[PDB]
Design a protein around this ligand. Structure first.
Ligand SMILES: [Ca+2]
Ligand SMILES: [Ca+2]
Ligand SMILES: [Ca+2]
Ligand SMILES: [Ca+2]
Ligand SMILES: [Ca+2]
Lengths: 375, 374, 375, 375, 376
């Protein structure tokens, strides 16, 4: 994930242009090899036309160039790229929104499951660890960085996500499918055991816990679905064929023909097709947006930082359910205890943001006494 | 389902280019018959023009070809194709999102329904089997592969989705509609009997069970809806006529005329219309996207693996409610029992992914002491 | 509703082409009258130009034809048709998704409301009949087929959706608005009476019943909303003006001029403007998609079968709450009672769909022993 | 709101063309002033060019017209208008979907809150009046028609939405913000008091009541959000600049030049630029769609009838919670008491809609005997 | 936030035209620096072409101008601009929808948590203050204005959002990540203690409280998500290069060439490229839409008033849970106590809006007696 949110907070003078001086997660990084190949092919064709063809062969090449340039169309490639990239971006943000965060569940585990002794602490840690284990199982199923971090379940055992007893239980329950769903059944059974043991005082709390757990399960299932059900290969190939046919046609039709031939549109040989190269920039960078975002769990610069998410979830969950259980700050009256209208101060750098409230768009409507009387 | 998610994990040099070498679920596999018909018709017309027409007939055909190639641009084949394919893809992903997964329900059945004896085990298995039976009943109605697997309800009995008593009950209750809804009423009544029998301790657990069951019911109803309410035939016909008329026109207008006639754009006889073939691949593959995805429950390569989903759901549900009921790993202190800041290790192949925490975009804003004062 | 889902299950050779031989719900059925009018006008103009115009008048008409052809543009009509038809299709599917199905509610009524005697059976039937009555009350207000089936509330009484007592109560509660909301308040009060009478054992079951009932209420309110709040008339008129002005100017600009005058683009004098007729096909069929789908409760072929939905809902609801209440099949051990990994058989026609499980995209990642070691 | 749903129920011959004969909510009504101004400017420029310019000035104006005709492009204006109008229509329908309807809440108040005496009736009426008061408080802030109906809170007192005690309480709770949220806190506290007083039998009914109330609160907050957070002014100005610059350059570039000069495309002086006027109607009507729908709570013909919604909500809510509380029709066996398969009759005008059930697309799949045996 | 909702209530004559006379949040305010740079470069190039080139170089510049004017159409600025700006606007409204509002939670805290004494009042205030501290903790992380208001957690202590005990507790629990999630765990534990202490009468009310709190948690997490996961930089750079290359090309190709050369399309020297300037306004304002909306928590005119939202949420929440707890207006019969059909009056300015009810589109369908009878 490349974050530039701070750099585009305000629409200043050339705010987006200053982003052109970036390299990580940039279009140059994703485009330099393709552009070098295209440049080499274009100039090889140019040198063949100039220094390797006879006059009749050059005339044939010029007719071919005009014929090709009559075929280079902007609307179809732009439309297919726009629709495909919109689909890819929608799926990319949906895949992000299905990344499981145990924060609601860890709050409910810290609150509902009672006991400051070793048994209650162990129970809360085990529940939140089941949640984190399910999350890390689906993430190592779908993310290449997480899989490189945990190539096997024994790596999960050595990393503390899974105890050896849990690993043996998972091996005993082995089915010819992905077994990421198991910790959710473990969570349900352990929560039922906790309620029957008195650690959960009411079944309302048990229902809330299992509702948050099922929400996490649905998110992990959506992650598995997006990893499994790819965008259909035919649509990807359609967009690739559109872009590649466009620039294969440009490889010949955008050649600078001999200016002495007085061909319309070929009155100035600039050697470098700056507009064709700009088109390559735009269209193949539009394609590279989709190429980078089609699997946002790879190892691109703009791909999701799933290992950081895993570590943060584990640390925050364990802290919330173990150290922060019934460990509250002292409850004391606040600054506005006797003030019916609080007014927090503004700094010197923020005093310009103290704005009057919006009372509705109809507040300033002016009416006379005659028209404000009820009929 | 053709999965290539691993091949496109990173945006490498020609990551989408290597996908053009695939055959299953590809443009070529979906397109070779149409392309062969187009090729044969194109070259039949070419040989008729060049070897079977008189000079006046050749001149008439040349004028017709120029007219067709002039008016080929009148056919909108990118707007309607784009919007129609977007609609088809949206509906295809919605149809996937309504595939029922009993995982939440199987967790709730494994937990809430108590009893390690034969009666409680039978009750849990019967409830989860009602869920799976409803799912398979809607899938054999919406999917051709599942129907080929279960042509009759007796096939469902012989496959273990239905008992003979359930089949007799379904035959007795028969109405002149699709009866996929029956196992949901069965689940509701069996769960009510379980709660009244003490197997479910509180009615809130019963409410949660029936909420998950109703979620599965809504998903199956949406599957039936997508199978029933097709995309309007007029829109499909518009797109189909657009594409096929474009290429029926290209059959004549993209012919290479006589180079001796010195027609503008026809001075060279290239024999093979390479750009017309690339346009054919692009446009008719764009149509084939919609053709393959309009019914994602058929037998295409990129259609849903519904038989696998059925088998996996049955196995996982039965295991979760039967073997995994109150069967937990031993609860022991973890690796970070006395570590307030856990830090799982990184491998040598993953040490580069250890990133610092993102603390918000405003973290690095620098303010002097004068402007930081209230 | 015209269903062709079985015909397009697989992307076979010309799967969409076999859909061109259909008449019900087809483009020809929606287009033949407009196309006949357009063709008649086009050939009237052609005969006037060819047989009833002087040479100076013919030259004037040729200039006018060239001018009109120069002013025929495809970009704006295509854009407005795409956006408008996308809006219409989205609204059409949302209108379908708001069709109330009582299946969840009928399951809850069959389960929660206890009693195998006449009183409990009557209570369950009355509750599910209130649900069906609300659905039919909104449907006869939004659907012309249902209104033709039930032109009056007395027709609903004669059809069994309303008892005479319910009709008298509805007439007593008459307000100058649509009274489709009344059965929901009836359902709430009858469910409260059932819970107070002991027929509903716990108030949480009552809450679930009223939640499903409120979901049906929201769906019926959305149906009323879509019937009431039409797509703005200005947008519809804009699209209609675009399409009809396009083809009014094609009526003159697409005329075949005299090839003897050697006009650019008029070298070949056909009689049938095949490309103009194809454009009429595409654009007026695109418009007819919106014309058919703008009110999906009319009597078009592709409109919703709301009478069938009403009949099916009534039958299924009454069967579920009356005959299926506590009427379960005998609970016996299944085929896989002691089999830990069930393997349902495949037929000969389905053996090719037996697939290995997808274990995640990272399953086949290969790493060496050195790089799989924790640092 | 202009409703034409009944007129477009079926896709008949010229279904959308008959909607061009409308005046209320029409494109003509929204466009006639702008079109008159454009007509006047165009013909003033024409008369200046033809009667008030010297021959050299006429040649300069002809060159300027030929220069202007090149800068008249359709793709950008169509693209921006399509996207902007799609955004406006999406926001318009979302603003409709956040119009609060108390039907679910009024059903729950009629059911859960018990008591046929004066205290229970007063409690139910006051609760539903709090709901309606919150709705009207947000509506008079976001809608100009409601504000013209209730210019002040005293107008709400005189209209029965607010009692004098409630008005004094609202004056006491005055903060420098919009106070539409106050009736929700009132509802929560009064419902808590009702549960403590025995009028609500179980806390789960109280939870359902407050859930419906919070749904109404979220809808009203979304209404306030849409009234406050407008579409960004830069985007509205971008679309306005595109449209009006297009037609400002059409004022000169679409002038009919002198036919004697035989300019390309100017061989015919038709006086009236019919196609330019059609483009004006189409594009500025596309803009007027956004202009009308950008604030759907104004006083346009297609804007929401919020005063009717207010009146209907008040009447229906008071009737549902007061007169319809525990006032049910007599519970008697229906028409299909012992009939297992109900079959309501069809009229002579609806008998053609009796359709056989759709059993799934795979019902008609034919397989021979050999391919049905399990392997 | 620039609000012009009142000005566009009705589609009057030139309703959008009057919006062009605005300055705050306008095209001009976001555009004038780039437009001045473009003007300067355009006229520098014009003066170089006219007064600083020889004839053999003027011919080359004229050929280059004709070439650029011919090939300016190759830049697909409209397509990528439209798709990118649509994405930015969708994300902008989604970012708005995840701004947390404590109104549902403050209603539940005011109702469920009982006690008019000091302990119950303190408990309600502390719970609602935990919700508002979580909101302000995420907002000072995602919004630059809120961060300028609260550069440190000590500023939150001095502003009343956080007590010194809460600040010490937050420092004790410190983790290397952002700690906006802590007040949610505090709320859960304090609500559990309140239920165990009898201040919450039933666990159903506790579940409702924690449901509203978790909804606020999800909204704040989505705010953090949008602040973290930016729109991919490659797409942004594509759009930026499209616009900037289009106008760098227009710098040369839109030059008014010498009319003595009688070039087609360059026979009239207007000096000022009015249509090129209109294209600049349109295209770069379309870009500035995305530039302003890509981070809606900055300090632009149309960015969200997050400081006002923070202050309003704090004031309204504290008032709702403290002063308004069990403080109800006197319950008395209303105006329509014995009126079966309530009819609120209309003013003279609103009597035109008294409209009849819509009974359904099928109400006016006319059928004769023969076709209305049920088929036997
Ligand atoms: Ca990637
Ligand atoms: Ca298929
Ligand atoms: Ca219709
Ligand atoms: Ca308006
Ligand atoms: Ca900003």
């Amino acid at each position: 994930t490349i974050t530039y949110t701070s750099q585009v907070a305000n629409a200043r003078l050339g705010s987006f242009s200053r982003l052109l001086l970036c390299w990580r997660g940039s279009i140059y990084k994703l485009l330099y090899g393709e552009f070098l190949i295209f440049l080499l092919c274009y100039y090889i064709i140019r040198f063949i036309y100039r220094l390797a063809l006879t006059e009749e062969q050059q005339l044939m090449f010029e007719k071919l160039t005009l014929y090709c340039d009559s075929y280079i169309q902007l609307i179809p490639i732009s439309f297919v790229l726009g629709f495909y990239v919109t689909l890819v971006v929608t799926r990319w943000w949906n895949q992000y929104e299905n990344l499981p965060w145990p924060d609601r569940l860890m709050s409910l585990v810290s609150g509902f499951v009672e006991g400051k002794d070793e048994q209650g602490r162990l129970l809360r840690r085990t529940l939140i660890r089941y949640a984190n284990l399910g999350n890390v199982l689906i993430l190592r199923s779908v993310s290449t960085a997480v899989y490189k971090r945990f190539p096997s379940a024994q790596h999960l055992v050595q990393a503390g996500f899974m105890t050896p007893a849990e690993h043996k239980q998972l091996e005993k329950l082995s089915l010819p499918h992905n077994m990421f769903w198991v910790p959710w059944v473990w969570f349900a059974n352990l929560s039922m055991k906790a309620w029957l043991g008195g650690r959960i005082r009411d079944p309302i709390l048990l229902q809330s816990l299992l509702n948050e757990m099922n929400t996490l399960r649905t998110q992990c299932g959506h992650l598995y679905a997006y990893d499994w059900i790819s965008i259909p290969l035919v649509y990807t190939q359609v967009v690739t064929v559109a872009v590649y046919s466009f620039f294969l046609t440009c490889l010949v039709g955008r050649q600078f023909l001999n200016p002495a031939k007085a061909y319309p549109g070929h009155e100035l040989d600039l050697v470098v097709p700056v507009f064709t190269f700009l088109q390559f920039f735009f269209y193949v960078g539009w394609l590279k947006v989709a190429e980078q975002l089609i699997n946002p769990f790879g190892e691109d610069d703009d791909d999701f930082e799933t290992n950081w998410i895993v570590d943060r979830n584990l640390q925050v969950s364990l802290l919330a359910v173990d150290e922060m259980h019934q460990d509250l700050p002292r409850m004391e009256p606040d600054m506005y205890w006797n003030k019916p209208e609080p007014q927090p101060p503004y700094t010197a750098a923020s005093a310009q943001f103290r704005r009057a409230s919006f009372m509705g768009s109809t507040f300033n409507i002016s009416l006379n006494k005659e028209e404000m009387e009820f009929q």
